[PDB]
Design a protein around this motif. Structure first.
Motif, PDB file in Angstrom:
ATOM      1  N   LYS A  61       0.819  -1.221   0.000  1.00  0.00           N
ATOM      2  CA  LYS A  61       0.000   0.000   0.000  1.00  0.00           C
ATOM      3  C   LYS A  61       0.859   1.281   0.000  1.00  0.00           C
ATOM      4  O   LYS A  61       1.695   1.447   0.892  1.00  0.00           O
ATOM      5  CB  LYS A  61      -0.947   0.002   1.227  1.00  0.00           C
ATOM      6  CG  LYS A  61      -2.094   1.006   1.137  1.00  0.00           C
ATOM      7  CD  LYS A  61      -3.301   0.614   2.000  1.00  0.00           C
ATOM      8  CE  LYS A  61      -3.128   0.910   3.476  1.00  0.00           C
ATOM      9  NZ  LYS A  61      -2.729  -0.303   4.242  1.00  0.00           N
ATOM     10  N   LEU A  62       0.602   2.203  -0.955  1.00  0.00           N
ATOM     11  CA  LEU A  62       1.308   3.483  -1.065  1.00  0.00           C
ATOM     12  C   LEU A  62       0.264   4.591  -1.156  1.00  0.00           C
ATOM     13  O   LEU A  62      -0.623   4.529  -2.023  1.00  0.00           O
ATOM     14  CB  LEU A  62       2.194   3.447  -2.333  1.00  0.00           C
ATOM     15  CG  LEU A  62       3.301   4.466  -2.605  1.00  0.00           C
ATOM     16  CD1 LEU A  62       2.797   5.637  -3.368  1.00  0.00           C
ATOM     17  CD2 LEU A  62       4.116   4.832  -1.371  1.00  0.00           C
ATOM     18  N   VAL A  63       0.319   5.566  -0.231  1.00  0.00           N
ATOM     19  CA  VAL A  63      -0.594   6.709  -0.237  1.00  0.00           C
ATOM     20  C   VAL A  63       0.231   7.973  -0.105  1.00  0.00           C
ATOM     21  O   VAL A  63       1.062   8.091   0.807  1.00  0.00           O
ATOM     22  CB  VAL A  63      -1.696   6.678   0.858  1.00  0.00           C
ATOM     23  CG1 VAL A  63      -2.750   7.776   0.601  1.00  0.00           C
ATOM     24  CG2 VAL A  63      -2.342   5.306   0.973  1.00  0.00           C
ATOM     25  N   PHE A  64      -0.053   8.939  -0.965  1.00  0.00           N
ATOM     26  CA  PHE A  64       0.570  10.257  -0.914  1.00  0.00           C
ATOM     27  C   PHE A  64      -0.504  11.335  -1.117  1.00  0.00           C
ATOM     28  O   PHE A  64      -1.357  11.172  -1.993  1.00  0.00           O
ATOM     29  CB  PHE A  64       1.665  10.358  -1.995  1.00  0.00           C
ATOM     30  CG  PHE A  64       1.993  11.753  -2.462  1.00  0.00           C
ATOM     31  CD1 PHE A  64       2.695  12.631  -1.642  1.00  0.00           C
ATOM     32  CD2 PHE A  64       1.594  12.194  -3.723  1.00  0.00           C
ATOM     33  CE1 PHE A  64       2.974  13.932  -2.064  1.00  0.00           C
ATOM     34  CE2 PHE A  64       1.894  13.488  -4.155  1.00  0.00           C
ATOM     35  CZ  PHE A  64       2.595  14.347  -3.326  1.00  0.00           C
ATOM     36  N   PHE A  65      -0.466  12.437  -0.317  1.00  0.00           N
ATOM     37  CA  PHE A  65      -1.349  13.588  -0.529  1.00  0.00           C
ATOM     38  C   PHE A  65      -0.715  14.868  -0.066  1.00  0.00           C
ATOM     39  O   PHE A  65       0.222  14.827   0.730  1.00  0.00           O
ATOM     40  CB  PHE A  65      -2.769  13.410   0.029  1.00  0.00           C
ATOM     41  CG  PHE A  65      -2.884  13.069   1.489  1.00  0.00           C
ATOM     42  CD1 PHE A  65      -2.825  14.065   2.457  1.00  0.00           C
ATOM     43  CD2 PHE A  65      -3.071  11.758   1.895  1.00  0.00           C
ATOM     44  CE1 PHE A  65      -2.918  13.743   3.814  1.00  0.00           C
ATOM     45  CE2 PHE A  65      -3.128  11.429   3.250  1.00  0.00           C
ATOM     46  CZ  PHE A  65      -3.081  12.428   4.198  1.00  0.00           C
ATOM     47  N   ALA A  66      -1.216  16.009  -0.594  1.00  0.00           N
ATOM     48  CA  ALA A  66      -0.746  17.365  -0.319  1.00  0.00           C
ATOM     49  C   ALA A  66      -1.760  18.365  -0.838  1.00  0.00           C
ATOM     50  O   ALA A  66      -2.194  18.230  -2.008  1.00  0.00           O
ATOM     51  CB  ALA A  66       0.600  17.599  -0.990  1.00  0.00           C
ATOM     52  N   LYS A 110       1.943  17.932   3.515  1.00  0.00           N
ATOM     53  CA  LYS A 110       1.956  16.683   2.747  1.00  0.00           C
ATOM     54  C   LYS A 110       2.053  15.446   3.621  1.00  0.00           C
ATOM     55  O   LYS A 110       2.468  15.543   4.771  1.00  0.00           O
ATOM     56  CB  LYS A 110       3.109  16.677   1.717  1.00  0.00           C
ATOM     57  CG  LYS A 110       4.519  16.658   2.332  1.00  0.00           C
ATOM     58  CD  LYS A 110       5.183  17.997   2.206  1.00  0.00           C
ATOM     59  CE  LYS A 110       6.509  18.007   2.904  1.00  0.00           C
ATOM     60  NZ  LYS A 110       7.293  19.209   2.534  1.00  0.00           N
ATOM     61  N   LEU A 111       1.735  14.265   3.049  1.00  0.00           N
ATOM     62  CA  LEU A 111       1.859  12.982   3.742  1.00  0.00           C
ATOM     63  C   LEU A 111       2.255  11.859   2.760  1.00  0.00           C
ATOM     64  O   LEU A 111       1.648  11.736   1.706  1.00  0.00           O
ATOM     65  CB  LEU A 111       0.518  12.674   4.447  1.00  0.00           C
ATOM     66  CG  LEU A 111       0.303  11.384   5.266  1.00  0.00           C
ATOM     67  CD1 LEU A 111       0.173  10.104   4.411  1.00  0.00           C
ATOM     68  CD2 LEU A 111       1.196  11.267   6.420  1.00  0.00           C
ATOM     69  N   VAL A 112       3.248  11.035   3.128  1.00  0.00           N
ATOM     70  CA  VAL A 112       3.682   9.846   2.392  1.00  0.00           C
ATOM     71  C   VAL A 112       3.539   8.686   3.354  1.00  0.00           C
ATOM     72  O   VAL A 112       4.117   8.717   4.447  1.00  0.00           O
ATOM     73  CB  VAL A 112       5.146   9.900   1.899  1.00  0.00           C
ATOM     74  CG1 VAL A 112       5.498   8.659   1.061  1.00  0.00           C
ATOM     75  CG2 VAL A 112       5.435  11.183   1.136  1.00  0.00           C
ATOM     76  N   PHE A 113       2.835   7.637   2.919  1.00  0.00           N
ATOM     77  CA  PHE A 113       2.630   6.421   3.692  1.00  0.00           C
ATOM     78  C   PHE A 113       2.988   5.224   2.813  1.00  0.00           C
ATOM     79  O   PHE A 113       2.556   5.144   1.650  1.00  0.00           O
ATOM     80  CB  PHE A 113       1.148   6.319   4.107  1.00  0.00           C
ATOM     81  CG  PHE A 113       0.782   5.020   4.792  1.00  0.00           C
ATOM     82  CD1 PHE A 113       0.753   4.935   6.173  1.00  0.00           C
ATOM     83  CD2 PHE A 113       0.411   3.902   4.051  1.00  0.00           C
ATOM     84  CE1 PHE A 113       0.418   3.743   6.808  1.00  0.00           C
ATOM     85  CE2 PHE A 113       0.073   2.705   4.687  1.00  0.00           C
ATOM     86  CZ  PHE A 113       0.060   2.642   6.067  1.00  0.00           C
ATOM     87  N   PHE A 114       3.702   4.265   3.390  1.00  0.00           N
ATOM     88  CA  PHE A 114       4.005   3.011   2.708  1.00  0.00           C
ATOM     89  C   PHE A 114       3.909   1.880   3.700  1.00  0.00           C
ATOM     90  O   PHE A 114       4.554   1.929   4.739  1.00  0.00           O
ATOM     91  CB  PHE A 114       5.374   3.021   1.972  1.00  0.00           C
ATOM     92  CG  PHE A 114       5.789   1.644   1.491  1.00  0.00           C
ATOM     93  CD1 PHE A 114       5.288   1.122   0.308  1.00  0.00           C
ATOM     94  CD2 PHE A 114       6.651   0.854   2.249  1.00  0.00           C
ATOM     95  CE1 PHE A 114       5.643  -0.165  -0.110  1.00  0.00           C
ATOM     96  CE2 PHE A 114       7.027  -0.421   1.815  1.00  0.00           C
ATOM     97  CZ  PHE A 114       6.515  -0.923   0.643  1.00  0.00           C
ATOM     98  N   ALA A 115       3.075   0.876   3.386  1.00  0.00           N
ATOM     99  CA  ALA A 115       2.928  -0.339   4.190  1.00  0.00           C
ATOM    100  C   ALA A 115       3.057  -1.515   3.239  1.00  0.00           C
ATOM    101  O   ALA A 115       2.266  -1.590   2.272  1.00  0.00           O
ATOM    102  CB  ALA A 115       1.576  -0.366   4.874  1.00  0.00           C
TER     103      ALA A 115
END
Lengths: 6, 6, 6, 6, 6, 6, 6, 6, 6, 6, 6, 6
Positions: free
Chosen positions: K1-6, L1-6
């Motif tokens: 799972k990869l999520v990015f926002f801004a 901003k936000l970056v998430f990786f699982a």
């Protein structure tokens, strides 16, 4: 799932 | 803006 | 599924 | 704008 | 801005 | 899961 | 499935 | 805009 | 699954 | 903007 | 799972 | 901003 509100 | 997915 | 509202 | 799909 | 995921 | 609010 | 809108 | 691919 | 919006 | 990949 | 926002 | 990786 994903919920986004701007 | 409202976005939902699953 | 996907729901979008702008 | 309203978009829905599944 | 509100973001939720799982 | 993740909850973000700005 | 591929969906694009703008 | 929105791009979706499943 | 790939989703992008702006 | 938002980019999601699962 | 990869999520990015801004 | 936000970056998430699982």
């Amino acid at each position: 799932k994903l919920v986004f509100f701007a």
